[PDB]
Structures are given as structure tokens and as C-alpha cells.
Ligand binder design. Structure first.
Ligand code: HEM
Ligand code: HEM
Ligand SMILES: Cc1cc(N)nc(C[C@@H]2CNC[C@@H]2OCCCCCc2ccccn2)c1
Ligand SMILES: Cc1cc(N)nc(C[C@@H]2CNC[C@@H]2OCCCCCc2ccccn2)c1
Ligand SMILES: C[C@H](O)[C@H](O)[C@H]1CNc2nc(N)[nH]c(=O)c2N1
Ligand SMILES: C[C@H](O)[C@H](O)[C@H]1CNc2nc(N)[nH]c(=O)c2N1
Ligand SMILES: [Zn+2]
Lengths: 402, 404
């Protein structure tokens, strides 16, 4: 019934009992595991509402209380007549942190209780959304001393279109498709660059042009808003011993703010609820700069390092990746902007796994995402078995609005 | 789309559907409620149906599906099971099944080689002494003075009542792990138990970091007998670095031949409890897992010290830097010693080609992502960006309980 989970470095074993609380099926069946895949009415809403209000009052040790009975009654009353309900700010705050806590793909969950939540549910226009988005960025960046935050726009409603941020992150570099097939700037962002231009943006021609935000209020053409350059902290990349590295003119932004995921709490859905923490250095160093379908800088670096490129067995790739990760760590430290390396991050995650075992009887985790993109077995998470399942509140993927 | 798993490669942006998983007869450990893909560890009427299915696979592989030889062989199997409870495989059926078991193995990144496997039939073997001869012959052939050749030796299958053939050691070549008075381990901590069992059964132990263990071989219904490998048979590679001159002075070494001896090979219901197989190493197995795991040789700190790295802080990437050099040393030393080895880039590129072959041939390929992606430099290899469907096909290599 309950999965035995072993750590192979320390020989220790736990039993996950928290998965018994899952209500949403994943992609796997007894016939085939599909775990490495990146992508996937009153009575129903009511029971998700009840369950979540239970979660809430239990979390403040007021389970069973008067205030608890009277809240379940309100929600019942509101659904029974409107087909939906609304959350109190504190319940919202509880739900957002729990959605982060439950995120199986997140290695930063040790921080889950430290989350600044901006209630933006009194938002009626793209203009307003933009104002909130700027306050979020200002707060989250905090002159390099990054602080986690989420800003929660108005929930989905039966009648009308969603509030949406079209951009996948609040900060993204343009990718400019070229006549000769290739991309200039960030290949991940070709389509979103093209949508911006379509909706009227004057393009630049650099590899690090910060995109404008396309913000959408229900049932309206999305609107374009340029972030003021002052708001977007960037870090120029250099290397501590290699002088020529800085000459590559490479850089990256401080704030990782995801803005396309949907926040589900108690069956309510928040289609625009951007959140940010801080980067783990491998996201920038390994994936963003070294993925072949991204900035793909490995060879350029290896050639600068005068490495033997002609053969795989010289490990020129592994050697250059390390220097690029180190340049990221060094550059962020020198700019006094928050960053965590993959060894410190996974060590803190083990700690988190242990806390959640005592607290909840397990922890949902996606091994393929938790283990870093380089030096996997050098980190303690590699050696840790992990059980993956969906709890609610949750961050989910959603369709692109166009 | 089709209702078969859609599978995407995020580097190339290409889609396939896996239709081969339809063939799976054995449940793995996952359910809609929770994914368990990261766990290392997840007869009668039954026999006949497994047997029928293997025979059909066999006749299909030789394009004689529906033929008289096919239905007569089916009939031949049914009759044999009807009277004896069991049946026996024809020689070419065993060769086909051993290859197909390797081809079906979701945890093996080396499967582009699957069609090239030397199968030694040893189903005549009737003593622990004779197992030893077969194994020595295997090691001799597979090692081939360094020009390694994949091979499997197949010992008699399980029988009703009668006891199993078993090789007690988990690999044909293993270094001793000696438990110290201060709680530490000299040698390979992975091998503490088998070391203790060897001693119990009369082995005179050494005291090095790289003592080759003897074989504990078990014939039906007997206590296991102990056999020492002649050291000229066990090819080893001393380890050195191409530029760090001090690295040879560590006295690190590894053996050439990776030969797994504790897996059960299952074909058409029949269970071969002793069927050791060998290939050649991918360098990360040695340079990263065996030499650097905290619970194995654990040499990272030692190497980083010699390289003068700042080991007091994670953020110097000292671990990553030391691992790279240890991996480079493994590759360099094997190349120098003319012993076959494959780096993790070459290997995983080769596995992408194999995935594409099998898409055309069988409509998919069972694959365990967490095992296929190397333990260093993950996202630098193309398999990282490749979604994979994991499932159990038969023939198969399975794990089995330890014989003690
Ligand atoms: C405190 C700093 C944080 C760090 C260091 C961190 C670390 C990471 C990393 C390395 C990933 C994988 C990223 C990738 O490969 O693209 C990730 C994913 C994720 N994190 Fe965090 N995280 C942090 C804070 C947060 C916060 C504040 C939230 C939400 C409130 C969050 C929710 C998520 C979610 C939902 C994912 C999966 C994203 C997706 O599927 O696109 N994390 N985290
Ligand atoms: C030809 C060269 C070969 C290479 C480079 C290779 C590579 C590998 C690697 C790197 C692993 C992962 C092991 C670990 O993490 O410790 C593995 C596992 C495995 N390979 Fe191979 N392989 C080769 C040949 C073979 C052969 C000949 C067979 C059997 C006929 C085989 C069957 C297996 C099986 C069953 C596993 C799973 C082992 C387990 O779970 O303990 N491979 N292979
Ligand atoms: C449709 C879709 C939406 C989404 N949010 N995520 C995915 C998964 C892919 C895998 N690569 C790009 C995208 O995920 C990027 C998520 C980046 C998270 C950045 C972060 C967030 C918080 C803390 C530290 N770092 C797909
Ligand atoms: C009970 C059990 C049996 C088994 N064979 N394998 C495992 C998995 C664990 C994970 N680490 C050690 C052990 O697996 C060792 C597999 C050795 C593969 C060696 C190899 C074989 C062929 C080619 C290249 N490399 C468990
Ligand atoms: C196909 C595979 O699932 C995909 O490349 C995953 C693997 N693990 C990952 N892990 C993290 N943290 N981020 C990712 O984007 C991915 N990509
Ligand atoms: C917990 C996890 O399953 C375990 O550490 C796995 C991960 N991936 C692996 N991959 C390979 N090739 N070999 C292994 O032994 C492991 N170990
Ligand atoms: Zn699964």
C-alpha cells in the first residue's frame, strides 16, 4: 500500500504515507512509467473547497472550532448560489505557500514558509496588472538581496476570459529568427518575441534584449508594457582566473519569475499568479548557456580554453561546463546578488525531505528535475529514492493563450 | 493523436509514439496515484502462455510466423510441459532469447551493441568445478587481451524441487572490502558482505584496497565452493592522468571486464539463475560512481586536495573539478592500456542512434531515464533531452534474491 523509500548513500529507509492524500492522477500506469515526460460543477468544487478549508483551520490548530464551522457554511452558501466562492486573504496566503511546498519539481522548497504574497485580486486592467508586476519585481529583487514572492491576480470565472501573462517569465531575452534558419538571442523565446513584434514592439538586435510584457485582461487583446531598465537587475559574467571570459560579453538577469503557471487552491484557479525565488547556478550556467537549443556557448568557451575539441574523450564539454558554472557563481557573488550552487541547494533539499517526513509522512519529488544537470551523482539527491504525486494546492501548466 | 505514449526530444523538437509498450506483460511499480520510477528495486498454465509467446517471438524474428515449423514447435512445447511440467529451449532459441533480453533491458545504455553477443551454451554443466572452467573460458574470450567482446554464459535452468545453479558474487571481478576496527572499510565498501562470506567459506584474506575476490560458485543442492581466479586472467588497468603527474602515485586501478553474475535470465517462462554476462565499461561507471560515490572508494576529497582546490566551500565546484579529472584519468589510462572503454558522450550519442533504430524496428524502446542519463554531465549528453517510456518486456534480465 505504502512505498518504501531508501537512501542508497546512508542505507536509511522511510515509508511515504503522504501520497495516500493524492486526488489527481499522474501519467504512469502499472504497464509503463511515464515519469520522465515534461508535460501531461458544484459537487466537485465543493469537496475541494471543504478539503482545503480543513487544511487551513488544521494549519492554525483551530480545527473543529466555531470559526471553522462558520467558514465551511459561508463557502457552501456561496457555491450553492453562485457556482463559485472566494478566498479570504489569509487562506490565500496559506494556499500559495502550500502550493510551493507541494511542487514536486522544486529543489528550493526548504524556503517554502518564507514567501511574500501580494494579493492582486482587485485588478481590473492590464495597466493595473503592470503596476502590480512592477511592485513585485521591485520587492523581489531588493537590490540583489532576493526575496521570494508571488502576486496573485483575479481567479478564473465561468463567464469570461482569464487574466493572463503571456510571457513565460517576467524577464526573458528576445530570440530573433533569422532568414538563414538560426536564432539570435535566446532560442527558447522565438515565438514570444514574434508575438510582441506583432502586437507592436520595436525590436532590437542584441543577444540580451529584455522583452516587454504582454499582459491580458479578460477578453481583450493583450497589451504591451516595457519594463523600466532600472527594474531589471542583470549580472555581467566574468571568470575569476580566465580574463578572456568577460570578453565573451555574456550576462544574465537576477530574478527568476515564472509567470505562465496556474495556481489551484481549493478548486479555484488563478491563471495569472507570477512567482519568483532566486536561481540555482546550474539553471543559468548549464541549461540556459549550454543547452544546444539555447545560447549553446560550450564550443566557444572550449575553444577559448584551447581544449581539444576533435574528440569527446578529452571531456572538453565537461571541462568547459564547469568553468561556465563557476563564472556564474563568481559573477553573482561579486555583484552581491543571491544565488545558490547545486551542492548547497541539494544539501538543503535533503534537510527539507527530512523535515517533511516528520511533518507530513512524506514529500512529493520528481527525481529527474531535482537531480542537477551536471555532477548528478556528486550530489546527495542522486542517491535518494523519491516518490512523485500530485497534492493540492498546486502549480500546474496551462495552455498558451493564443 | 494515437493512444500510445507520445514521446518528445526537447533538443530536436521531434515526436514519436511508443507502440511497443502494448507488448508488455509484466507490471512495473508505478500507478496513476504515484510514480515510483526512481526506486532501484521494484508454475503450470502460466508457463505455457509465457512459452507460447516466446516461441511466436522466435518465429517472427526468423520471418516464419504461421508456418508448420512454428506450429509443430508450439505443439512440441505444449506436449513437453504437459508431461514434465517444464520444457527445454533449442540452441538458436537460447541465442535469440539472450540477445532479446539484452535488447529489452531498460537500464542499459549500451544496447546499440545488442545484436553482437557471443552466447556460450553451458546448459550441460553439472558441477561447481565445471562452472569454474566455463567462467574462465568466458573471461578469457570476453577479455581478449583488452579488445573486449560481449558474451554471456548460460548455465542449467531452474528445475522443480532440485536446487539452483548460483554464482554468489554479484560480479565476476570484485575488490575485497575489509571492515576495520575503527568502523571504516579498506577496499570496496560495496563488497563487505561477499568478502565476509568468502572468508567464512575458507578464503585466506589479504589487506589491500584492490584485492580480487575469489568466486563462490554453487551447483545444485550443494554448499558453494570457492575458486581463486588466476591473476593473468583478470586484466587490470593502473590509473594515471595525462597531465597531472602525481595522479599515478595514488595507486588507483580498475579491472577491465564488467561481468554481472547475479541476475536471473528469464526466457519463455524458463529461469536461468546463473547466466553471467559481460560487456565493456562506460567510463563514468568507474571514474564517477566506483571511485567517487561517498559510500564506495570516496576519493574526491583526496583528489581535490592534490589539485589544491578550495574544499571548504561548495561554491568552488571542487567536487565537479575533481570528478572531471578522475574521469579523464579513467579514459586516458584505458586508451593507453589498449583496453576497450566508452566515454559518456560517445555512449549516449550511440544510444540515441539505437533509439531511432528501435523506433523503426519495434515502435519504441523501454528505457529507464534515471539510469540512462550519466551521473556526471547529464544535460550535456543528448539522452537528457529525450523523454523515455519504461516498461518490462520478456525475455528479460531480472534481479533475484541472494542465495544465502
Ligand atoms: C527560493 C528560491 C528557489 C529556488 C533556489 C528554486 C529552485 C528551483 C529549481 C532549480 C527548479 C527547476 C528549474 C528548471 O530546471 O527550470 C525549480 C522549479 C520550480 N519551482 Fe522553485 N525554487 C525557488 C523558489 C520557488 C518559489 C518561490 C516557488 C513558488 C512560490 C517555486 C516553485 C517552483 C515550481 C512550481 C517549479 C516547477 C517549474 C516548472 O514546472 O516550470 N520555487 N525550483
Ligand atoms: C557492450 C558494452 C556495454 C556497455 C557500455 C553497457 C553499459 C551499461 C551501463 C553504463 C549500465 C548501468 C550500470 C550501472 O549504473 O552500474 C548498464 C546496465 C545494464 N546492462 Fe549494459 N552495457 C554493455 C553491455 C551489456 C551486455 C552484454 C549486457 C547483457 C547481455 C548488458 C545488460 C545490462 C543490464 C541487464 C543492465 C542493468 C544492470 C542492473 O540493473 O544491475 N549490457 N549497461
Ligand atoms: C508549458 C510549460 C510551462 C512551464 N512553466 N514549464 C514547463 C517546463 C519547461 C522546462 N524548461 C522550460 C520550462 O520550465 C522553466 C521553469 C523555470 C523555473 C525557474 C525558477 C523558478 C523558481 C526558482 C528558480 N528558478 C512547460
Ligand atoms: C540486487 C541488484 C542486482 C543487480 N544486478 N543490480 C542492482 C543495482 C545496483 C546499483 N548499483 C550496483 C548494482 O548494479 C550494478 C550493475 C553493474 C553494471 C555493470 C556493467 C555491465 C555491463 C556493461 C557495463 N557495466 C541490484
Ligand atoms: C526529458 C527530460 O524529462 C527533460 O529534459 C527534463 C529532465 N530533468 C530536468 N530537470 C530540471 N530541473 N529542469 C528540466 O528542464 C529538466 N528537463
Ligand atoms: C535513487 C536512484 O534511483 C539511484 O541512485 C540510481 C539513480 N541512477 C542510476 N543510474 C545508473 N546507471 N546506475 C545507478 O546505480 C543509478 N542509481
Ligand atoms: Zn512512473
Amino acid at each position: 500500500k505504502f512505498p518504501r523509500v531508501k537512501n542508497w548513500e546512508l542505507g536509511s529507509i522511510t515509508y511515504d504515507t503522504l501520497c495516500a492524500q493524492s486526488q489527481q492522477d499522474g501519467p504512469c500506469t502499472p504497464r509503463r512509467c511515464l515519469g520522465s515526460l515534461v508535460l501531461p460543477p458544484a459537487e466537485q468544487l465543493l469537496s475541494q473547497a471543504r478539503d482545503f478549508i480543513n487544511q487551513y483551520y488544521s494549519s492554525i490548530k483551530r480545527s473543529g472550532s466555531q470559526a471553522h464551522e462558520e467558514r465551511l457554511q459561508e463557502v457552501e452558501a456561496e457555491v450553492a448560489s453562485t457556482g463559485t466562492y472566494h478566498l479570504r486573504e489569509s487562506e490565500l496566503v496559506f494556499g500559495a505557500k502550500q502550493a510551493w511546498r507541494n511542487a514536486p519539481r522544486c529543489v528550493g522548497r526548504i524556503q517554502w514558509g518564507k514567501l511574500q504574497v501580494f494579493d492582486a485580486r482587485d485588478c481590473s486592467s492590464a495597466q493595473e496588472m503592470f503596476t502590480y508586476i512592477c511592485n513585485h519585481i521591485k520587492y523581489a529583487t531588493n537590490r540583489g538581496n532576493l526575496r521570494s514572492a508571488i502576486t496573485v491576480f483575479p481567479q478564473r470565472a465561468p463567464g469570461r476570459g482569464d487574466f493572463r501573462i503571456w510571457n513565460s517569465q517576467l524577464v526573458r531575452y528576445a530570440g530573433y529568427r533569422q532568414q538563414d534558419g538560426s536564432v539570435r538571442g535566446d532560442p527558447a523565446n522565438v515565438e514570444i518575441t514574434e508575438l510582441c513584434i506583432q502586437h507592436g514592439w520595436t525590436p532590437g538586435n542584441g543577444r540580451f534584449d529584455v522583452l516587454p510584457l504582454l499582459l491580458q485582461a479578460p477578453d481583450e487583446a493583450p497589451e504591451l508594457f516595457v519594463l523600466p531598465p532600472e527594474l531589471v537587475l542583470e549580472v555581467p559574467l566574468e571568470h575569476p582566473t580566465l580574463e578572456w571570459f568577460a570578453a565573451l560579453g555574456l550576462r544574465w538577469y537576477a530574478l527568476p519569475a515564472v509567470s505562465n503557471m496556474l495556481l489551484e487552491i481549493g478548486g479555484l484557479e488563478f491563471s495569472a499568479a507570477p512567482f519568483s525565488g532566486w536561481y540555482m547556478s546550474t539553471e543559468i550556467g548549464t541549461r540556459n548557456l549550454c543547452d544546444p537549443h539555447r545560447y549553446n556557448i560550450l564550443e566557444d568557451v572550449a575553444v577559448c580554453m584551447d581544449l581539444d575539441t576533435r574528440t569527446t574523450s578529452s571531456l572538453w564539454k565537461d571541462k568547459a561546463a564547469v568553468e561556465i558554472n563557476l563564472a556564474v557563481l563568481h559573477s553573482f557573488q561579486l555583484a552581491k546578488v543571491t544565488i545558490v550552487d547545486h551542492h548547497a541547494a541539494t544539501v538543503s533539499f535533503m534537510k527539507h525531505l527530512d523535515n517533511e517526513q516528520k511533518a507530513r509522512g512524506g514529500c512529493p519529488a520528481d527525481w529527474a528535475w531535482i537531480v542537477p544537470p551536471i555532477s548528478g551523482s556528486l550530489t546527495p539527491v542522486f542517491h535518494q529514492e523519491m516518490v512523485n504525486y500530485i497534492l493540492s494546492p498546486a502549480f500546474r501548466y496551462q495552455p498558451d493563450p493564443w
